[PDB]
């Protein structure tokens, strides 16, 4: 089966862990632990098409070499963390030496009321990139299936 290797980036405590580990395993990991590295794997079926799903789910600010699409994660109550959105896609644009990367710009933690970024901030800025935005919540698990099913569309989009 055809395989995607899929790069979790974003600033920390953005829930990039609680997002990978609510995509493969199902239920949310609450208690913080800083992630030195990790990485997952699961076989799904996107659209009909069956594939394995390389996910690697790195630390806040080689891995970029690997990934073929890249999920950039901040949290719609952390304001850094969606400044810092326009960094990783420089740093992935400068290692794959290309402007079409295929991305997603991932807003998390959408069930808290704490909201300093809005949503059409977000989508003003993915807009601007070419690239989809979605709104996830790994505690509720809104969204979360749709982020990594987008980008593996994007891939193949891009790949085609
Ligand atoms: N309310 C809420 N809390 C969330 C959500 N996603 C993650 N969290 C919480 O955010 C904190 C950090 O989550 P975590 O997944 O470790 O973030 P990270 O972005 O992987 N961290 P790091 O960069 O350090 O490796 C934890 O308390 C986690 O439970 C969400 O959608 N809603
Ligand atoms: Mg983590």
Same mark, same amino acid.
Request: hydrophobic share 35%; charged share 30%; net charge negative.
């Given at each position: 089966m055809t395989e995607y290797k899929l790069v979790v980036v974003g600033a920390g405590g953005v829930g990039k862990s609680a +997002?990978?580990?609510? =995509?493969?395993? !199902?239920?949310?990991?609450?208690?913080?632990? @800083?992630?030195?590295?990790d990485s997952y794997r699961k076989?799904?079926?996107?659209? $009909?098409?069956?594939?394995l799903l390389d996910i690697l789910?790195?630390?806040?600010?080689?891995?970029? #070499?690997? $990934?073929? $699409?890249? =999920?950039?994660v901040?949290?719609?109550? !952390?304001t850094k963390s969606f400044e810092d959105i326009h960094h990783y896609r420089e740093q992935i644009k400068r290692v794959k030496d290309s402007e079409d990367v295929p991305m997603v710009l991932v807003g998390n933690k959408c069930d808290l009321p704490s909201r300093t970024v809005d949503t059409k901030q977000a989508?003003? =800025?993915?807009?601007?990139? $070419?690239? @989809?935005?979605?709104?996830?919540?790994?505690?509720? #698990?809104q969204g979360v299936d749709d982020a990594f099913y987008t +980008?593996? #569309?994007?891939?193949? %989009?891009? %790949?085609?």
């Amino acid at each position: 089966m055809t395989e995607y290797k899929l790069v979790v980036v974003g600033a920390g405590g953005v829930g990039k862990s609680a +997002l990978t580990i609510q =995509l493969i395993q !199902n239920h949310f990991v609450d208690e913080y632990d @800083p992630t030195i590295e990790d990485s997952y794997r699961k076989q799904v079926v996107i659209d $009909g098409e069956t594939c394995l799903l390389d996910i690697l789910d790195t630390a806040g600010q080689q891995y970029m #070499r690997t $990934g073929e $699409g890249f =999920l950039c994660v901040f949290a719609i109550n !952390n304001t850094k963390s969606f400044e810092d959105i326009h960094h990783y896609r420089e740093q992935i644009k400068r290692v794959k030496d290309s402007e079409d990367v295929p991305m997603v710009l991932v807003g998390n933690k959408c069930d808290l009321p704490s909201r300093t970024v809005d949503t059409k901030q977000a989508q003003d =800025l993915a807009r601007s990139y $070419g690239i @989809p935005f979605i709104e996830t919540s790994a505690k509720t #698990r809104q969204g979360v299936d749709d982020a990594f099913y987008t +980008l593996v #569309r994007e891939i193949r %989009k891009h %790949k085609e």
